[PDB]
Scaffold this active site. Structure first.
Site, PDB file in Angstrom:
ATOM      1  N   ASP A 540      31.135   1.155 -47.094  1.00  0.00           N
ATOM      2  CA  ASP A 540      30.289   2.180 -47.675  1.00  0.00           C
ATOM      3  C   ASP A 540      30.551   2.369 -49.165  1.00  0.00           C
ATOM      4  OD1 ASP A 540      29.730   2.529 -44.900  1.00  0.00           O
ATOM      5  OD2 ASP A 540      29.687   4.733 -45.021  1.00  0.00           O
ATOM      6  N   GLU A 737      39.608   5.425 -36.575  1.00  0.00           N
ATOM      7  CA  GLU A 737      38.634   4.705 -37.373  1.00  0.00           C
ATOM      8  C   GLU A 737      39.319   3.821 -38.413  1.00  0.00           C
ATOM      9  OE1 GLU A 737      35.573   7.368 -38.918  1.00  0.00           O
ATOM     10  OE2 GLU A 737      34.529   5.663 -39.873  1.00  0.00           O
TER      11      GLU A 737
HETATM   12  O1  UF6 Z   1      27.926  14.449 -34.497  1.00  0.00           O
HETATM   13  N1  UF6 Z   1      28.916  14.841 -35.377  1.00  0.00           N
HETATM   14  O2  UF6 Z   1      29.512  16.095 -35.249  1.00  0.00           O
HETATM   15  C1  UF6 Z   1      29.339  13.949 -36.431  1.00  0.00           C
HETATM   16  C2  UF6 Z   1      28.508  13.046 -37.061  1.00  0.00           C
HETATM   17  C3  UF6 Z   1      29.001  12.211 -38.037  1.00  0.00           C
HETATM   18  N2  UF6 Z   1      28.103  11.272 -38.710  1.00  0.00           N
HETATM   19  C4  UF6 Z   1      27.712   9.960 -38.238  1.00  0.00           C
HETATM   20  C5  UF6 Z   1      27.443   9.022 -39.430  1.00  0.00           C
HETATM   21  C6  UF6 Z   1      27.557   7.547 -39.062  1.00  0.00           C
HETATM   22  C7  UF6 Z   1      29.000   7.040 -38.984  1.00  0.00           C
HETATM   23  C8  UF6 Z   1      29.104   5.578 -39.393  1.00  0.00           C
HETATM   24  C9  UF6 Z   1      30.507   4.971 -39.372  1.00  0.00           C
HETATM   25  N3  UF6 Z   1      30.418   4.000 -39.982  1.00  0.00           N
HETATM   26  C10 UF6 Z   1      31.246   3.912 -41.135  1.00  0.00           C
HETATM   27  C11 UF6 Z   1      30.993   2.665 -41.927  1.00  0.00           C
HETATM   28  O3  UF6 Z   1      31.961   2.504 -42.984  1.00  0.00           O
HETATM   29  C12 UF6 Z   1      31.016   1.516 -41.107  1.00  0.00           C
HETATM   30  O4  UF6 Z   1      30.849   0.269 -41.882  1.00  0.00           O
HETATM   31  C13 UF6 Z   1      29.940   1.803 -40.259  1.00  0.00           C
HETATM   32  O5  UF6 Z   1      29.341   0.682 -39.788  1.00  0.00           O
HETATM   33  C14 UF6 Z   1      30.407   2.781 -39.172  1.00  0.00           C
HETATM   34  C15 UF6 Z   1      29.570   2.890 -38.048  1.00  0.00           C
HETATM   35  O6  UF6 Z   1      30.478   3.319 -37.119  1.00  0.00           O
HETATM   36  C16 UF6 Z   1      30.320  12.309 -38.419  1.00  0.00           C
HETATM   37  C17 UF6 Z   1      31.130  13.231 -37.795  1.00  0.00           C
HETATM   38  C18 UF6 Z   1      32.600  13.448 -38.055  1.00  0.00           C
HETATM   39  C19 UF6 Z   1      33.196  14.497 -37.427  1.00  0.00           C
HETATM   40  C20 UF6 Z   1      34.530  14.740 -37.590  1.00  0.00           C
HETATM   41  N4  UF6 Z   1      35.230  13.945 -38.341  1.00  0.00           N
HETATM   42  C21 UF6 Z   1      34.682  12.934 -38.950  1.00  0.00           C
HETATM   43  C22 UF6 Z   1      33.351  12.631 -38.829  1.00  0.00           C
HETATM   44  C23 UF6 Z   1      30.645  14.033 -36.810  1.00  0.00           C
END
Ligand code: UF6
Length: 767
Positions: A540, A737
Site C-alpha cells: 500500500d 497481519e
Molecule cells: O470491519 N472492520 O471493523 C474493519 C475494516 C477494516 N478495513 C478493511 C480494508 C481492507 C484491508 C486490506 C488488507 N490488505 C492490506 C494490504 O497491504 C494488502 O496488500 C492487502 O492485499 C490486504 C488485504 O488483506 C479494517 C479494520 C481494522 C480493525 C482493527 N484493526 C485494524 C484494522 C476493521
C-alpha cells in the site's frame, strides 16, 4: 471423465459452514437457498442481552480468541470459541454425511462450557436462526404437542428445487432449563424451547440480529400492554423468551435458555439420501473426521527440523485449519464504476486529481449477481475475496487438496469480465456490503492486483508433469492427467485474456521519452496510484516515485508479467498452442532484457522503479526493500546471475533488510523507514518472506556460485519467520497481519489467516 469428476467435486463441496463472517453457520454453494446461524449471549439484567449477544465475528477485549482446531471442507471440523464477556468456552463440531442427489447431509454439535469466572448459575440465551430464500420453496416447524413450546426436539420440514425434500432438527440437548414461578408462566409457560416462524422479503433474511430483536421487542411490548410491570417483573430470561409460534415461513427462530453448561445438536437430513441423520451418526462421523484430518496432516504437512516437535505440530494445525476454515461462499451484486471515464487513463501529469474528479461523478452502480467460493484474510475485519491474497492462501490449500484449490481458482476466474478484469476486492451482496463503508465498496475496472493465482497454477503444472472417496477426489485432477488438461484447456483462454489485459491497461510508456532498451514494448505502470499510496500493487504505502507520473515504471509489475508469461509458456505448451508459445517466448526474452535496461541500478546493486525527471529523462528511484528484490522473488533471474548475487547480499545485510524476525519490508537505511502509516515501510510481512524463502531454497538445491550463501540464508530465514509467528501464536493465540522488526511482536490485525498461514508450508519444506 472430466465431466464426471466435476459433478463429484460439485457434490462433495456443496455443503459447508461457508459463512466465515459469523461465528457459526452453514450454507450450500447456492445463491438463494437454506442458511443457518448461531447466536448466544448471557443474560444478567433487563438490558444486557442486546450488548452481550454474539453473531457476526469481531475481535476485542471481550473475546479471548476463536478458530478452527481442525477443518476440511469435504468432511467438516471443530471450532473453539473463548468468550470472556459471556464467560463461555464453546465448541462447534460440524460434519458432512454424503448420500442422495442433493449434496448429502450434515450435523453439528454446539457445546457451551462455562469458564471458572462465570456465575455457576449463569443464564445463557442460545438461538439457532434458519432462513430460506427462493420463490418455489417451503419450510415449516412441526408444532409442539405441549402448549407453550417444545419439551423435546424441534423439527423443521422443508423443500426446494435445489435441495429437494429435507428435514432440519434442533435437538432438545443436555443442560438445566431454568423454570419461572411467575404469573406469566400461565401464559408463556415456566420455560422451554420455543420457535417463531416468520416471513420477510427474501433479500433481508440475512439480517438475523435485527430480525430477532424485532421479535424480542414485540414480546416486551406485549408484557407492558398486559400489565407485567416493575411492581412484580418476570425474571430477565423469561422476559427475553419468545412466545412460541411455529408455522410456515422463510425465517425460523429456535430459542433455548440454559443455566450452566449446555449442548445440543443440529441434524440436517437430505430426504433423497438413505435414513435420517442421528446424534449417534454425528458423534461417530466427528471421531472419524478427526482421524482422517490427523493422518492427512502428518503426510501433507510433515514438518522438518527444527520444527518436528509437538508444539510446532499443534501450531501448524492451528495455522492451517484457520486458513482453510476461512473458506466462504458469497453471492450477490457488486458496486462498479462502469463509466471508464477518460481521466482513469492517467496519461497527464497530476492524474490523481483528475481521477478524483471522475470518482466524484459517482457513476458506479450495482451489477451481477456474482458468486465466489474463496478463502479470506480476516474473519473479524474483512471476510471476503482479495485477489492477490488468494494466490498465497491457496499454496497450503493446494498441498492439502489440489482439487479444492482448482475449484477456488475456477470460481475466481468465472468473475472475469469481457476485457479480462477481475475486481481485486470482491464485495458480493448486501450481507458483504454491511462490513464495508459505502465510500470503499466501488471497484474500478482499471485497478489490477498481483496475479499470484498463477503461482498456484505453476504448482499444479509441476504436480501434473510428475483410498477413501474424499482422498480420491482431492487429487483426481493430478492422478487423471486427462482431467487436469481439460481444466487447463478451459482456463487457458481466460489466463491469456488477463495477460492481454495487463498489457493493455497497465502499460508503461517507453516511446514518448529519451528511453532506450532492448524492447520498445515491455514496460509497466500500476494504474490507480495516489500521492501516498499504490493499493493495486498490494504494497500500500511502499515508497514510489514522487510525485506520481505517467512515465513511472514499476519493477514489481513487470516481474508479475514475467510470472504470467512463464506460466503461459508451460500451460500453452501442454496444450500445443505453438503460435502463442512463440509469442510468449519473445515476451519473456524482452522482459529479462528490459528488467536490466530499465530497472537495474549498478550503482545501488538492486532493482529500482523508474520515473521521468523534471528534465524528462528516465531516472531510477531506489528504495531498498521488498520492491528491490522483485525479479528474484518472482523467480526470474538465472542462478549464476551476478545481479542475483548482489540481491543476496542485500537480503542478508542486517543494516538493510535482515532483522532477527525476518526481512524488513523497507531498509532501515532508506529515508522512508518507519514513516507515515508505516504499513509496508519496515514491518515483516509473511507473504513476501515466503517468496524469499522459496527462492533461496531453489538456489540452495542447485549447482552455482551462490548455492552456499543461499543455503545459509534459507536455513536462517525459515527459522526466523517460523519462530516469530510461532512465538506470537504461543503468547497471543493469533496469527498477525505483520510483525515488528525491532521487537518481533505481531501487530495490526489478528485472525490474519490470511497469508500468515504460509508458515505451515515453510515448516514443511521440500519445495
Ligand atoms: O470491519 N472492520 O471493523 C474493519 C475494516 C477494516 N478495513 C478493511 C480494508 C481492507 C484491508 C486490506 C488488507 N490488505 C492490506 C494490504 O497491504 C494488502 O496488500 C492487502 O492485499 C490486504 C488485504 O488483506 C479494517 C479494520 C481494522 C480493525 C482493527 N484493526 C485494524 C484494522 C476493521
Amino acid at each position: 471423465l472430466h465431466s464426471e469428476i466435476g459433478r463429484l467435486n460439485n457434490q462433495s463441496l456443496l455443503w459447508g459452514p461457508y459463512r466465515p463472517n459469523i461465528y457459526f453457520g452453514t450454507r450450500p454453494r447456492i445463491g438463494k437457498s437454506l442458511m443457518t446461524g448461531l447466536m448466544w449471549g448471557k443474560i444478567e439484567s433487563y438490558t444486557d442481552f442486546q450488548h452481550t449477544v454474539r453473531y457476526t465475528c469481531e475481535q476485542n477485549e471481550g473475546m479471548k480468541g476463536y478458530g478452527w482446531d481442525e477443518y476440511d471442507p469435504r468432511r467438516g471440523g471443530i471450532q473453539s470459541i473463548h468468550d470472556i464477556q459471556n464467560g463461555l468456552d464453546i465448541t462447534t463440531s460440524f460434519v458432512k454425511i454424503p448420500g442422495g442427489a442433493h449434496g448429502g447431509s450434515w450435523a453439528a454439535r454446539i457445546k457451551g462450557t462455562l469458564n471458572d469466572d462465570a456465575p455457576k448459575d449463569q443464564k445463557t440465551i442460545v438461538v439457532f436462526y434458519v432462513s430460506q430464500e427462493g420463490e418455489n420453496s417451503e419450510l415449516e416447524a412441526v408444532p409442539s404437542e405441549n402448549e407453550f413450546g417444545y419439551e423435546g426436539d424441534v423439527i423443521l420440514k422443508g423443500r426446494s428445487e435445489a435441495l429437494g425434500n429435507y428435514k432440519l432438527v434442533v435437538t432438545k440437548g443436555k443442560g438445566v432449563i431454568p423454570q419461572s414461578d411467575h404469573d406469566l408462566s400461565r401464559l408463556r409457560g415456566p420455560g422451554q424451547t420455543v420457535v417463531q416462524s416468520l416471513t420477510y422479503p427474501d433479500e433481508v433474511l440475512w439480517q438475523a440480529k435485527p430480525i430477532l430483536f424485532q421479535q424480542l421487542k414485540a414480546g416486551i411490548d406485549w408484557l407492558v400492554e398486559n400489565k407485567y410491570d416493575v411492581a412484580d417483573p418476570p425474571p430477565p430470561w423469561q422476559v427475553y423468551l419468545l412466545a412460541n409460534k411455529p408455522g410456515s415461513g422463510n425465517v425460523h427462530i429456535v430459542q433455548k435458555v440454559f443455566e450452566g453448561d449446555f449442548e445440543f445438536d443440529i441434524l440436517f437430513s437430505s430426504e433423497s439420501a438413505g435414513k435420517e441423520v442421528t446424534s449417534k451418526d454425528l458423534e461417530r462421523e466427528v471421531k472419524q473426521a478427526t482421524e482422517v484430518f490427523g493422518e492427512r496432516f502428518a503426510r501433507v504437512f510433515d514438518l522438518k527440523a527444527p520444527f518436528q516437535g509437538d508444539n510446532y505440530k499443534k501450531f501448524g494445525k492451528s495455522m492451517f485449519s484457520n486458513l482453510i476454515g476461512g473458506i466462504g461462499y458469497f453471492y450477490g451484486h457488486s458496486l462498479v464504476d462502469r463509466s471508464y471515464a477518460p481521466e482513469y487513463d492517467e496519461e497527464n501529469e497530476g492524474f490523481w486529481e483528475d481521477a478524483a474528479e471522475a470518482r466524484a461523478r459517482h457513476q458506479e452502480a450495482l451489477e451481477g449477481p456474482y458468486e465466489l467460493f474463496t478463502s479470506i484474510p480476516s474473519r473479524p475485519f474483512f471476510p471476503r475475496g482479495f485477489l492477490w491474497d488468494e494466490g498465497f492462501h491457496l499454496l497450503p490449500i493446494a498441498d492439502w487438496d489440489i482439487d479444492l484449490a482448482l475449484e477456488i481458482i475456477k470460481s475466481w476466474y468465472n468473475l472475469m469480465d469481457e476485457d479480462g478484469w477481475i475486481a481485486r476486492e470482491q464485495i458480493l451482496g448486501a450481507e458483504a456490503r454491511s462490513k464495508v463503508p459505502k465510500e470503499f465498496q466501488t471497484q474500478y475496472p482499471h485497478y489490477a492486483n498481483p496475479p499470484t493465482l498463477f503461482l498456484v497454477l505453476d504448482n499444479f503444472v509441476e504436480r501434473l508433469r510428475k483410498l477413501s472417496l474424499d482422498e480420491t477426489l482431492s487429487t483426481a485432477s493430478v492422478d487423471n492427467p486427462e482431467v487436469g488438461l481439460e481444466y487447463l484447456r478451459r482456463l487457458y483462454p481466460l489466463l491469456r485474456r488477463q495477460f492481454d489485459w495487463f498489457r493493455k491497461t497497465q502499460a508503461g510508456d517507453i516511446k514518448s521519452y529519451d528511453r532506450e532498451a532492448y524492447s520498445t514494448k515491455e514496460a509497466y505502470r500500476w494504474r490507480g496510484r495516489t500521492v501516498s499510496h499504490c493499493l493495486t500493487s498490494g504494497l500500500d504505502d511502499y515508497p514510489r516515485p514522487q510525485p506520481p507520473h505517467p512515465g513511472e515504471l514499476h519493477v514489481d509489475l513487470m516481474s508479475w508479467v514475467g510470472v504470467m508469461v512463464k506460466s503461459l509458456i508451460s500451460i500453452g505448451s501442454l496444450l500445443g498452442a505453438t503460435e502463442d508459445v512463440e509469442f510468449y517466448t519473445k515476451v519473456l526474452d524482452a522482459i529479462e532484457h528490459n528488467l536490466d535496461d530499465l530497472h537495474w541500478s549498478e550503482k545501488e546493486g538492486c532493482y529500482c522503479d523508474a520515473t521521468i525527471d523534471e528534465f524528462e529523462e528516465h531516472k531510477l528511484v531506489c528504495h531498498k526493500g521488498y520492491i528491490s528484490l522483485f525479479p528474484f522473488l518472482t523467480g526470474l533471474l538465472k542462478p549464476d546471475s551476478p545481479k542475483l548475487g548482489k540481491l543476496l547480499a542485500l537480503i542478508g545485510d542486517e543494516s538493510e533488510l535482515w532483522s532477527p524476525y525476518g526481512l524488513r519490508s523497507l531498509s532501515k537505511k532508506d529515508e522512508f523507514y518507519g514513516t507515515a502509516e508505516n504499513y509496508w515501510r519496515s514491518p515483516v510481512w509473511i507473504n513476501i518472506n515466503y517468496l524469499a524463502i522459496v527462492q533461496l531454497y531453489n538456489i540452495a538445491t542447485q549447482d552455482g556460485p551462490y548455492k552456499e550463501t543461499a543455503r545459509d540464508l534459507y536455513t536462517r530465514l525459515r527459522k526466523n519467520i517460523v519462530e516469530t509467528v510461532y512465538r506470537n501464536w504461543e503468547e497471543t493465540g493469533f496469527a498477525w497481519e505483520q510483525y515488528n522488526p525491532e521487537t518481533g511482536k505481531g501487530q495490526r490485525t489478528q485472525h490474519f489467516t490470511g497469508w500468515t498461514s504460509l508458515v505451515v508450508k515453510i515448516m514443511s519444506g521440500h519445495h
